[PDB]
């Protein structure tokens, strides 16, 4: 169970912090991800964070501007977004992949949170 929140309509150059709350699984044994689907339906990987937060990676178009962390308030994954461009509009999903098994990145997905950068 993955639920994303925090998405909204902001203007270019804005900041927004997305949240993904986990439940129903161990969390500490899952790599977490942020993926966005554009209005065209294309899927674009945003970032990755390992279990333990020892390793993280971002897409180039996102590096420096976006910041991912699986902090603990209570089983949470975060994505701090700043310098928002129109190009960042889309539905953001968090996803996970179990550490012990080797399947595919983003084995499971949440419901999504839309973010629209415009006007």
């Amino acid at each position: 169970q993955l639920v994303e929140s925090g998405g909204g309509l902001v203007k270019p150059g804005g900041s927004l912090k997305l949240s993904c709350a986990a439940s129903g699984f161990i969390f500490s044994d899952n790599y977490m991800y942020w993926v966005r689907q554009t209005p065209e339906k294309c899927l674009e990987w945003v970032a990755t964070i390992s279990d333990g937060g020892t390793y993280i990676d971002y897409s180039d178009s996102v590096k420096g501007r976006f910041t991912i962390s699986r902090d603990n308030a209570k089983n949470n994954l975060y994505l701090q977004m700043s310098s928002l461009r129109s190009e960042d509009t889309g539905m953001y999903y968090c996803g996970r992949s179990p550490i012990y098994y080797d399947y595919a990145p983003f084995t499971y997905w949440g419901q999504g949170t839309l973010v629209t950068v415009s006007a």
């Binding site: 339906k41 899927l43 990987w45 983003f106 997905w109 999504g112």
Partner: protein, 112 residues
Amino acid sequence: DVVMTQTPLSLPVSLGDQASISCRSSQNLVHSDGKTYLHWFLQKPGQSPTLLIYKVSNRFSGVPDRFSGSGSGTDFILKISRVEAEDLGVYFCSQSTHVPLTFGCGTKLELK
């Protein structure tokens, strides 16, 4: 990065039909470790994507055997045996051999 190309864009099908989706990569997806990190996800209407087949031909838990993946290097194909209404949605191929991890823009399976 690695550009994933899916053909066709829309695929009208009838219930019971046999179908194949093609996915081509701009680069060889065989990783230096000898594995091919090519995957397929299904996004049913109004849902979130779901893992269908991982590493070219491995069906994920709960995936019917009507789904079969094949391919190598840069050309891959998804085969659907007997289309049923629950298969309707958008199929995306995805690679994780290279960083950035990239996706194709999908193939819409539509009831004709």
